[PDB]
Amino acid sequence: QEKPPKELVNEWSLKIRKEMRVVDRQIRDIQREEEKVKRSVKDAAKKGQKDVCIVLAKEMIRSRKAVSKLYASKAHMNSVLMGMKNQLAVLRVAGSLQKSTEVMKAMQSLVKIPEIQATMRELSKEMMKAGII
DSSP: OOOOOTTHHHHHHHHHHHHHHHHHHHHHHHHHHHHHHHHHHHHHHHTTOHHHHHHHHHHHHHHHHHHHHHHHHHHHHHHHHHHHHHHHHHHHHSSSOOOOSHHHHHHHHTOOSSSSTTHHHHHHHHHHHHTOO
């Protein structure tokens, strides 16, 4: 055969790490956009446009949840990263991966839709063949 050695872990670490830079990015962008929406809400209050503050508010809440759901995902990703560190650990003395109900649920809750998170469905796959999920 000619498989990759259990450096499939280093590979998946790199990707998980990559997607986490993405997340950081998206959080930063939404934050940056909250700054503006804030100024906007201010003016719109000062000028008595009640109806506009109201909606810019509903805008504000939606940002906040967007960031929440994001930091969530990042936690999940971090859970998969640690799981990989663990797998390396397990390999350091065995030399063969093994199951993980940890890197399974994170990588379950993680295969959501809004984002290129089709890759997560692929890692998911690669990982099962390996014998991690």
